[model samples]
Target: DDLVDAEGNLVENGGTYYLLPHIWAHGGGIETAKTGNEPCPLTVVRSPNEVSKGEPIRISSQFLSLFIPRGSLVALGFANPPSCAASPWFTVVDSPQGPAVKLSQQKLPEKDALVFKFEKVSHSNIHVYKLLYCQHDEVKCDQYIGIHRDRNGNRRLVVTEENPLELVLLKAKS
Candidate 1:
């Protein structure tokens, strides 16, 4: 069941997932404000609009114009002019943990499948998602997908190295 917090923000537990962009945060990452103005919100609808054994969901965003070049280091960000002249689109696969967003290049044998993890911050209304990448034949580790600020100070989503897992959410064509 969907529940609201003390601040009264819609807590999406299951069903259709909306990847709204948080413009209030630096670099414009996923928004967890729940109820407020969001910039360039991306929506990912489940195939049956319900949970299944393992099914891929349809992802669409108004900011599909922004692209990431194939084989290039994934760095999440926006572009000036939105156009089709961009990199390859991403593919969302179902995992035991949750939905896993992967890049086309990751399919290659030499590369590792870049997986994403959606997690909610404790006691706060923020849901911070992270990306994990690994080398061939090595264990996957958490990497910095973007930057965020907290009471501690400005913090980066980094683990060992400074490899940010950035991707362009392809918006649906109306």
Candidate 2:
């Protein structure tokens, strides 16, 4: 879920970014139940039209302070640390679908754009995976897929892969 090495900065310290798009895997559950009840089941595409359900999507600091002064190559998914661990560029909010609009909370106007409108209802699908790390030789993993369009539309696909799963580091600061 994390990469940022081209220059966008933040290439260390538990960084992570996993965005799965195109077919929401299987067993859908990203936002229904009235928007909240804790069940995005697994979704991540925080910006680029938006998508939220379990929180964890970042890369804003005004687009990573202008994508590291024009270098570009930023990653996403952050929690804390003076603006996502030593801000050099990072911003994204939809934390559990509260702020941001277009059906996540109803506030729009640049919270990264927000776009993850699901609910067609054919087979219902959703899938996503991301893992990152720092120290201990730094680790990383990413996988994404989402597709749901039932209600007569018909569309369902799900897949998750990034070399297995076992992410745990949850929090860090310094």
lDDT of 2 by residue, 1-174 (tens): 232332333334234333333333322222211122423212222222224322333433223342222222233332322221232222223333222221222222432232111111123222222222111122211222223333433232222233322211111222
Off by over 4 Å in 1: 1-23, 29-114, 147-174
Error of 1 at 81 (Å): 13
Worst 10 residues of 2 by lDDT: 132-141
- Backbone clashes, candidate 1: 4
- For each candidate in the order shown, give its overall lDDT on alpha carbons: 0.28, 0.27
